From a paper:
Three types of filaments were observed that were made of two identical protofilaments arranged in different ways. Filament structures were determined to resolutions ranging from 2.3 to 3.4 Å, which allowed us to establish their identity as CTE filament Types I-III. Types I-III of CTE filaments were present in the frontal cortex, with only Types I and II being found in the temporal cortex. The three types of filaments are molecular polymorphs consisting of two identical protofilaments that are linked in different ways. By cryo-EM, the tau fold was identical to that in CTE, SSPE and ALS/PDC. This is the first inherited tauopathy with the CTE fold.
Author numbering:
A (entry chain C), B (entry chain A), C (entry chain D), D (entry chain E), E (entry chain B): 305 to 379
The structure:
């Protein structure tokens, strides 16, 4: 016979305290952008991006993260 | 015979406290963008993006995250 | 014989507290955008985007997230 | 004879600029206040104040001030 | 004869610029206040203040000040 008992116990805490959060300034792409092109030949696909793209400001009050995985395999 | 007992127990906490959150400024793409093109030849697909695109400001009060996976496989 | 008992127990909490949230400014694409084109030839598909597109301001009071997966497979 | 010409000229400016103003917290008198009195004798006037009184939060966007006095006296 | 010409000229500026102003916390009088009195005698006037009184938070965006005085006296 085979008995398997799987009783993990989790009383954990993940916690943050912050008195104040702020005065955040993100200013990407303030300068001048000039692109001059003459007599170009493209035979295959082209992807072009010019300017200010995909810039992120991310300011969570907590931003705390907890990842837990359990697996029991029997063969 | 085979007995499998699967009793994980989770009393965990994920928590944040923030006294104040703010005064956030995101200013992408303030500068001038100039694109001059003459005599270009494209034989295949073109994708072009010019200016200020896909910029994100994300300011959650909490933003706390908890991921948990359980799997029991029997063969 | 085979017995499988699957009794996970979850008393978890995910929580945030924020005293105040605000004064958020997102100003993408303030600058001037100029695009001058002469004598261009395109033989295949074209996608073009000019200006200020797909910019996001996302400010949830909580924004807390809890993902849980359970699977039991028997063969 | 007497001539008096009084021609002051004022082209002055007083100015402020503020991008954002806020997330201000004023919390006076959070603690406990206990006052126990036995066998007191007062022969003249009494003024008493107990608790949280006359607390001020003052948050003007400008709050700019200009004072000007002119006087001409003749005897 | 007497001529008096009074022509002061004022082209002055007083100016401020602030990108962001905030996350200000004022918490006076958080502790406990206990006042026990027995067998006191007062023959003249009494003024008493107990607790949290007359606390100020003052947050002007500008708060710029210009004072100017002119006087011409003739005897």
């Amino acid at each position: 016979s085979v008995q398997i008992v799987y009783k993990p116990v989790d009383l954990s805490k993940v916690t943050s305290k912050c008195g104040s959060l702020g005065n955040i300034h993100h200013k990407p792409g303030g300068g001048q952008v000039e692109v001059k092109s003459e007599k170009l030949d493209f035979k295959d696909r082209v992807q072009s991006k010019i300017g200010s793209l995909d810039n992120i400001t991310h300011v969570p009050g907590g931003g705390n993260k907890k990842i837990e995985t359990h697996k029991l395999t029997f063969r």
